[PDB]
């Protein structure tokens, strides 16, 4: 049995599907999009029985800027780790993670995160992988709080437009909005979301995927919406195989800090959902939310669908 770097994305996608595909159906298009476009120091280490892949770990160190933020090289990530069901409890997971962790630690990592990377597949350890929590505990990861993906069927319900002060207006992004959008993100969301707007617009995100809220001529918030015409496959639609026809998704969404708590996020969400509804979307996801924000989406009939546990190892 040998541990070595692996390049065959198709073998990895198949092992993924065979083992967890019922709840996290992967495809090669998604896998390639997220692995290839990632800008971090990244690697896939495989475990092999002769020519046969029997396990893999995908892992990263934070080495590329996030908008205006410098990378923090002390942070590394376990994107994913799967050992094939016929080869469990032989120490292969341990070997794979020993290798990955040792590499990361030797390049200066002090904090190891389960998921939550750029171009992640998971915000944390999925509930469907709850038995792995013990695997991670044995290695010194600490189990923290939860994040959720929410689901709802926007075709089944109608809501009254929430009330708002005069002077605000929501519309799908137009090409001439790009400069205003970027100025707004540099001001209000100048880390990860800024970085993602920069990068995602280079690999197929289109203006039709973005909804903007303005106060008069100024951009004061946005959402990213998804349907089956989106070219860029973002987190709300990763698991689109589970969502049926006319799937969609919404996330992230953000309102300038000075404008928060006046009902403008509710208005943006409402109008974004109306857009999707008129696009004939049915089941759709809201990705990677926190418990205290579920009810914001809940009032629009979204419910928790998937849960992920944050988990962190501090290097001694």
Ligand X SMILES: CC(=O)SCCNC(=O)CCNC(=O)[C@H](O)C(C)(C)COP(=O)(O)OP(=O)(O)OC[C@H]1O[C@@H](n2cnc3c(N)ncnc32)[C@H](O)[C@@H]1OP(=O)(O)O
Ligand Y SMILES: N[C@@H]1[C@@H](O)[C@H](O[C@@H]2O[C@H](CO)[C@@H](O)[C@H](O)[C@H]2N)[C@@H](CO)O[C@@H]1O
Nearer to ligand COA, 46 or 252 (CB): 46
Query: Does the annotation list 262 as a binding residue?
Result: yes
Do the beta carbons of residue 23 and residue 5 sit within 8 Å?
Answer: no
Rule CB under 6 A: choose which of 29, 183, 186, 290 binds ligand Y.
290
Single residue of 101, 196, 227, 256 touching ligand Y by CB under 6 A: 196
Length of the chain counted residue by residue:
316
CB under 5 to 8 A by kind: which of ligand COA, ligand Y, ligand X, none does 196 bind?
A: ligand Y
Parallel, antiparallel or unpaired: strands 248-255 and 283-290: parallel
* b/e per residue 154-184 (b: at least 16 CB within 10 A): beeeeeeeeebeeebebeebeeebeebbeeb
Cβ-in-10-Å burial (0-12, 13-18, 19+) of 213 comes to buried
CB of 108 or CB of 304, closer to a second copy: 304
Q: Which of residues 17-56 bind ligand COA (CB under 6 A)?
A: 46
In the complex, least distance from residue 196 CB atom to ligand Y, rounded to whole angstroms: 6
Q: Provide the binding-site residues for ligand X, judged by CB under 6 A.
A: 19-20, 78, 80-83, 88-94, 114-115, 122, 125, 129, 131-132, 134-135, 138, 295, 298
Considering CB distances under 5 to 8 angstroms, the limit depending on partner class, which of ligand Y, a second copy, ligand X, none binds residue 290? ligand Y
- Counting beta carbons within 10 angstroms of the beta carbon of residue 307, is it exposed (0 to 12), middle (13 to 18) or buried (19 or more)? middle
Told to check if 248 binds a second copy by CB under 8 A, we report no
Positive or negative, the CA dihedral 110, 115, 116, 119 is positive
Answer yes or no whether residue 79 interacts with ligand COA by CB under 6 A. no
196 annotated to a ligand binding site: yes
Size of the site for ligand Y (CB under 6 A): 10
Residue 245: CB atoms within 10 A of its CB come to 10
Nearer to ligand Y, 21 or 67 (CB): 67
Query: Secondary structure of 62-121 in the HEC alphabet?
Result: CCCCECCECCCCCEEEEEEEEECHHHCCCCHHHHHHHHHHHHHHHCCCCEEEECCCCCCC
Stretch that binds a second copy, among 92-100, 103-111, 124-132, 175-183 (CB under 8 A): 124-132
Question: Does 167 interact with a second copy (rule: CB under 8 A)?
Answer: no
- Cα distance between residue 174 and residue 261, in whole Å: 27
Residue 34 binds ligand Y (CB under 6 A): no
Site for ligand Y in 210-269 (CB under 6 A): 235, 251-252
Q: For 237, which DSSP code? A: G
Binding site for acetyl-CoA, by residue number, is 81, 83, 89-91, 93-94, 129, 139, 253, 255, 261, 263, 265-266, 295
The footprint of ligand COA (CB under 6 A) covers 6-8, 11, 46
The footprint of ligand Y (CB under 6 A) covers 192-193, 196, 235, 251-252, 287-290
């Amino acid at each position: 049995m040998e541990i070595k770097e692996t390049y065959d994305f198709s073998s990895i996608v198949d092992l993924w599907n065979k083992n967890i595909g019922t709840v996290y159906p992967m495809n090669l298009e998604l896998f390639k999009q997220n692995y290839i476009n990632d800008r971090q120091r990244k690697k896939i280490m495989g475990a092999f029985n002769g020519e046969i892949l029997i396990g893999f770990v995908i892992y990263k160190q934070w080495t590329y800027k996030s908008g205006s933020l410098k990378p923090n090289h002390k942070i590394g990530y376990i994107n994913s780790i799967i050992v094939d069901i016929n080869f469990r409890h032989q120490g292969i997971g341990t070997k794979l993670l020993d290798a990955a962790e040792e590499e990361l630690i030797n390049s200066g990592v002090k904090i190891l995160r389960c998921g939550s990377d750029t171009y992640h597949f998971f915000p944390g350890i999925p509930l469907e992988c709850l038995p792995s929590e013990e695997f991670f505990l044995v290695r010194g990861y600490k189990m923290q709080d939860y994040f959720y993906d929410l689901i709802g069927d926007v075709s089944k319900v109608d809501f009254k437009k929430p009330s708002i002060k005069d002077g605000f207006k929501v519309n799908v992004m137009k090409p001439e909005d790009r400069k205003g959008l970027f100025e707004f993100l540099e001001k209000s969301f100048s880390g990860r979301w800024l970085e993602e707007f920069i990068e995602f617009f280079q690999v197929g995100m289109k203006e039709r995927d973005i909804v903007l809220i303005k106060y008069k001529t100024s951009v004061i918030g946005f959402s990213h919406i998804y349907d089956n015409k989106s070219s860029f496959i973002g987190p709300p639609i990763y698991w689109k195989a589970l969502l049926g026809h006319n799937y969609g998704g919404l996330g992230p969404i953000g309102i300038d800090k000075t404008y928060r708590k006046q009902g403008l996020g509710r208005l943006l969400l409402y109008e974004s959902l109306q857009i999707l509804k008129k696009r004939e979307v049915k089941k759709m996801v809201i990705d990677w939310t926190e418990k205290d924000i579920i009810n914001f989406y809940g009032r629009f009939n979204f419910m928790p669908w998937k849960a992920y546990r944050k988990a962190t190892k501090e290097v001694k």
